[PDB]
């Protein structure tokens, strides 16, 4: 309950510089590539084999997998600097902005800015610009150069709104059969963004574009963690207002006590975010 | 120092059956596929990115990665049947046979036999035959059955010999810079089998063929674990003989190859597995 996760827009300047410097350090030590690789690995673990579902996305484990993901990331951040906690990007408020690209998340001292149309939309500002930050492709091989392109696609021209978010928190069930993209009246599938998609979570990914635009390369962009921090917050909220489903008979890897590949951690291990030792501000 | 890992050729008929049934249970519960994926994932964690070194192969962590891999596998077997330990395929002994493909490891009560040439070398004998056991491809989707094709390639017509193993056991350095496929005077690279390859470990894969023939899909064949137990036994013997010698690199190698680095996809370090007796098991030849 001690580690406090803060709204990016509530961060002081040196809180932002310290977060940024820690990420780069994780990157120089080779630790950051473990999270890109883990996330890609999970995308290849289909439950059961052949199914649309994988360990991290498109099924019930989406939320607790990403909670465990961000939890391990935060610990590695803390091992470099015990004062660093993972912020969240509250995109529901940034959507209200005239030009959400002008949000202070995108400043030169934090995430850097939008892509540059001449340089194929390569990011050329901030600490993660090309030459200052290398990316890896789907194969684990060097791909060179972070890209972003806010709202370029017909499908996600806008960030999801607080209206969009308030409608997901109403859903009464965590998840429903058959625990996938078609799951109806499903908090998880609603938050993930496949109901009349792309919405919420999936919409943020398409709006940002670049590596963020395609799931297997998305964690190349450090804003991946800030986005998913916000998703984890929405879920923790839902866990106050209103457990987990399936408790059994889902495909292996999605049940309450199944390990989530590529870890041994179960959903049950992370149901209560407070017991994991962190809290979001406003809590 | 208590779970005894036995030569496959020494297993009783009941031991053979209990092992196979336990593996089948692992597969049915969805657990076996986690080991296939872990191995596939490790192969695309390159150290550093761009190098052909990866977390589990072609560098110093080849041996401890697999010690940890097999230890986790043996634990999962034990949780199903605490009397079942991971046996080892002593291929260097099979190589002395007129026809190694007649080894008892390939009998219908254990690993099953060679691939059927009429069926594109699909295995159709033993408990892992097509229709009883489904493989998956590098992408995580079902494939069409186990395949094997013993001794089919020109580079690997034979299994490695007892002398090939004895020769490797004379190498005095665990590994050497630059800790890769070209490492010379290196026990790790020698056992791995790249110099004037394919030898030893790489030669076994090429000899078996089918999914075993391409390292990213090799754990689809349960014999993967039996083969790598023989590898783990040979390294355990190397540590007994060269007791003065330790893992290399201690430091300064690529991240994920040093003594105290995490071995992707786990947090387990090489140091954590250096002493196999402290992991709870011994090979029968140690008595």
Write the DSSP symbol of residue A82.
Answer: T
B228 in a known ligand binding site: yes
How far CA B190 is from CA of A52, A193, B202, B216, in Å, comes to 42, 51, 10, 20
CA distance A2 to A259: 27
The DSSP code sequence of A233-279 is HHHHHHHHH---S-SSSSPTTSSTTS--TTSS--SGGGS-TTTTTEE
The shortest C-alpha distance from A115 to chain B (Å) reads 24
Distance of CA A213 to the CA centre of its chain: 12
Is residue A228 part of an annotated ligand binding site?
yes
Question: Which H or E run contains A165?
Answer: helix A162-170
Among A56, A69, A43, A114, which Cα is nearest to A229's? Answer: A69
Q: Cα–Cα distance between B258 and A99 in angstroms, integer?
A: 48
Cβ within 8 Å, pair A34-B41 = no
Residue A85 is given by DSSP the state -
| B225–chain A nearest CA distance, Å | 19
3-state secondary structure of A213: helix
Asked whether the beta carbons of B151 and B157 are under 8 A apart, the reply is: yes
CB contact under 8 A, B140 and A46: yes
State the Cα–Cα distance between residues B162 and B252, nearest whole angstrom.
35
Residue B46, SS3?
A: strand
Cis, peptide link before residue B19, omega less than 30° from 0: no
Handedness of CA A123, A127, A132, A133 (dihedral sign): negative
Spatial distance between the Cα atoms of A169 and A160, rounded to a whole number of angstroms: 14
Technique employed here was X-ray
Nearest Cα residue to A127 out of A217, A16, A5: A16
Nearest to A186 by CA among A166, A196, A170, A171: A171
- Distance from C-alpha of A156 to C-alpha of A147, rounded to nearest angstrom: 17
Q: Where are the beta strands (DSSP E) in B75-137?
A: 115-116, 122-123
- The resolution, in Å, is 2.1
Distance CA A160, CA A168 (A): 11
Q: Say whether B49 and A261 touch across the interface (CB within 8 A).
A: no
Nearest to B37 among A136, A251, A261 (CB): A261
Interface test with B, best of A45, A51, A219, A249 (most B CBs within 10 A): A45
User: For domain B3-98+150-286, is the CATH number 1.10.1280.10?
Assistant: yes
Alpha-carbon distances of A181 from A184, A200, A263, B213, rounded to whole Å? 9, 14, 23, 36
Distances B206 to A2, A57, B5, B200, B228 between C-alpha atoms, Å: 54, 36, 25, 10, 14
Residue A132 to residue A139: CA distance in whole angstroms: 21
**Alpha-helix residue ranges (DSSP H) falling in chain B:** 13-28, 32-43, 62-80, 91-94, 162-169, 187-192, 200-208, 223-241, 270-273
CA distance A130 to B82: 53
Structure tokens at A54: 């994988």
Number of Cβ within a 10 Å radius of residue B24: 17
Residue written as token pair 């092992």: B19
Q: In which residue are the tokens 């610009």 written?
A: A129
Q: How far apart are CA B221 and CA B215, in angstroms?
A: 11
CB atoms within 10 A of CB A83: 12
Chain A hits for B58, Cβ within 8 Å: none
Assigned CATH topology for domain A3-280 = di-copper center containing domain from catechol oxidase (1.10.1280)
Alpha-carbon span A32 to A233, nearest angstrom: 22
Q: Which residues contact B97 (CB under 8 A, 6 or more apart)?
A: B103
Instruction: List chain B residues with CB under 8 Å of A252.
Output: 29-31
Q: Which two tokens stand for residue B243?
A: 């007791």
Note whether B140 contacts A33, CB cutoff 8 Å: no
The residues facing A279 across adjacent strands are A4
Distance between CA atoms of A8 and B23, rounded to whole angstroms?
49
Q: CA A176 to CA A194: how far, in whole Å? A: 13
CB A93 within 8 A of CB A118: no
Q: Cβ B262–A45 below 8 Å, yes or no?
A: no
Cβ–Cβ under 8 Å, residues B174 and B218 = no
| Spatial CA neighbour of A259 closest among A45, A34, A7, A27 | A45
Closest CA to B269 of B61, B74, B43, B49: B61
Residue B230, min C-alpha distance to chain A (Å): 26
Backbone angles phi, psi at A54, to 5 degrees: -135, 175
Helices (H), ranges, B170-214: 187-192, 200-208
Neighbours of A77 (CB within 10 A): 23
Contacts of A254 in chain B (CB under 8 A): none
β-bridge mates for residue B283, sequence order: B5
Query: Any bridge partners for residue A278, and if so which?
Result: A3
β-pairing verdict for A278-280 and A3-5: parallel
Which one, of B78, B70, B85, lies nearest residue B219 by Cα?
Answer: B70
Which residue in this structure is represented by tokens 């190694």?
A: B100
Tokens for A112?
């850097």
Looking at the complex, report in whole angstroms how far the Cα of residue A49 sits from the nearest Cα belonging to chain B.
5
Residue B74 CA to residue B280 CA, distance in Å, equals: 11
What residue has token string 């670049």?
A210
């Amino acid at each position: 309950k001690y580690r406090v996760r803060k709204n990016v827009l509530h961060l002081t300047d040196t809180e932002k510089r310290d977060f940024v410097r820690t990420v780069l350090i994780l990157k120089e030590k080779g630790i950051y590539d473990r999270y890109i690789a883990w996330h890609g690995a999970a995308g290849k673990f289909h439950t059961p084999p052949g199914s649309d579902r994988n360990a991290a996305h498109m099924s019930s484990a989406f939320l607790p997998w990403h909670r465990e993901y961000l939890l391990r990331f935060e610990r590695d951040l803390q091992s470099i600097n015990p004062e660093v906690t993972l912020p969240y990007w509250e995109w529901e408020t940034d959507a209200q902005m005239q030009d959400p690209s002008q949000s202070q998340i995108w400043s030169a001292d934090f995430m850097g800015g939008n892509g540059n149309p001449i340089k194929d939309f390569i990011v050329d500002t901030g600490p993660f610009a090309a030459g200052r930050w290398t990316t890896i492709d789907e194969q684990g091989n060097p791909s060179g150069g972070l890209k972003r392109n806010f709202g370029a696609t017909k499908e996600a021209p806008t960030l999801p709104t607080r209206d969009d978010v308030l409608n997901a928190l109403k859903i009464t069930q965590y998840d429903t059969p058959p625990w996938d993209m078609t799951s109806q009246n499903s908090f998880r599938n609603q938050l993930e963004g496949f109901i009349n998609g792309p919405q919420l979570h999936n919409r943020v990914h398409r709006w940002v574009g670049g590596q963020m635009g395609v799931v297997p390369t998305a964690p190349n962009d450090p804003v991946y963690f800030l986005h998913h921090a916000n998703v984890d917050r929405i879920w923790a909220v839902w866990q106050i207002i209103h457990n987990y489903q399936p408790m059994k008979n889902g495909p292996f890897g999605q049940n309450f006590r199944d390990p989530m590949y590529p870890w041994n951690t179960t959903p049950e291990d992370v149901m209560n975010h407070r017991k994991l030792g962190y809290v979001y501000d406003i809590e």
